[PDB]
């Protein structure tokens, strides 16, 4: 299904009253989560979340556990260092976030890599698209940038993002192909809701789709309409699929002028729905 991504998301939250930070890590291929680590769970292991990663052997799980534990200790140190850089009190809780990963194109080859870091929910430092240079948001991050340049961090991450990352994404795509390379087109329908004697709400529904990217647009008499419409945020159904809807308020009797247009990777051509029923 066209381009693909592998991403890892890390959140560490300090606990100044007692103990070490809460650390949560999750891994995704496209919109499918496949691994988790949570420092508050009993296993203290990287754990599977998708069936197609369960066939990986114990050397894989030992390695992933080691990596994620070492990553967690680095964020523990970072929370202390950044507290210092920002002259903050030891009393408050603070958050580090890191995301990294790689995309491959429809040619199945490396497309882009990324590695981004945030402190208390704002950009801190980020690898640029060339994978050779850093964007530091402020003078604290500038200090990190200098540290990371002197340690050749970009070079190490670049090798991983262009090599290992892509190679393992491709492996996962083939091992999980039954699902990861299956597109689920939205199941669509329209509902009708009288709002008064003179107007009605049409609601266009897109359900049980994957991947999550979708576009729902209303038209009147073949022209895009955004006034008198509402669009909810795409949301997870909880079975691996997604849902969305878009609604438009119309003069009662004029429903037939309006069309919902649905665009999705699993649809060869977009769908058009109209209230006729």
């Amino acid at each position: 299904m066209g381009s693909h991504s592998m991403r890892y998301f890390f959140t560490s939250v300090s606990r100044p009253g007692r103990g070490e930070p809460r650390f949560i890590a999750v891994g995704y291929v496209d919109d499918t989560q496949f691994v988790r680590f949570d420092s508050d769970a009993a296993s203290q292991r990287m754990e599977p979340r998708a069936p197609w990663i369960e066939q990986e052997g114990p050397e894989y799980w030992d390695g992933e556990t080691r990596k994620v534990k070492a990553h967690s200790q680095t964020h523990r140190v970072d929370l202390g260092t950044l507290r210092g850089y920002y002259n903050q009190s030891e009393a408050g809780s603070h958050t580090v976030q890191r995301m990294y990963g790689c995309d491959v194109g429809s040619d199945w080859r490396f497309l882009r890599g990324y590695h981004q870091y945030a402190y208390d929910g704002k950009d801190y430092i980020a690898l640029k698209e060339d994978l050779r240079s850093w964007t530091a948001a402020d003078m604290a991050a500038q200090t990190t940038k200098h540290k990371w340049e002197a340690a050749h961090v970009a070079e190490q991450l670049r090798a991983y993002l262009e090599g290992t990352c892509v190679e393992w994404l491709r492996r996962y795509l083939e091992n999980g192909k039954e699902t990861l390379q299956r597109t689920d087109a939205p199941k669509t329908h329209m509902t009708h809701h009288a709002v008064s004697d003179h107007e009605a709400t049409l609601r266009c529904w897109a359900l049980s789709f994957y991947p999550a990217e979708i576009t729902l647009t209303w038209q009147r008499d073949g022209e895009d309409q955004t006034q008198d419409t509402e669009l909810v945020e795409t949301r997870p159904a909880g079975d691996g699929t997604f849902q969305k809807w878009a609604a438009v308020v119309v003069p009662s009797g004029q429903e037939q002028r309006y069309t919902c247009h649905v665009q999705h990777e699993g649809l060869p051509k977009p769908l058009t729905l109209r209230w006729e029923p």
Binding site: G27, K67, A70, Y124, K147, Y160
Partner: peptide
């Protein structure tokens, strides 16, 4: 497969 295990501190 994650990067690591050498994660350089900030």
């Amino acid at each position: 497969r994650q990067f690591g295990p050498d994660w350089i501190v900030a």
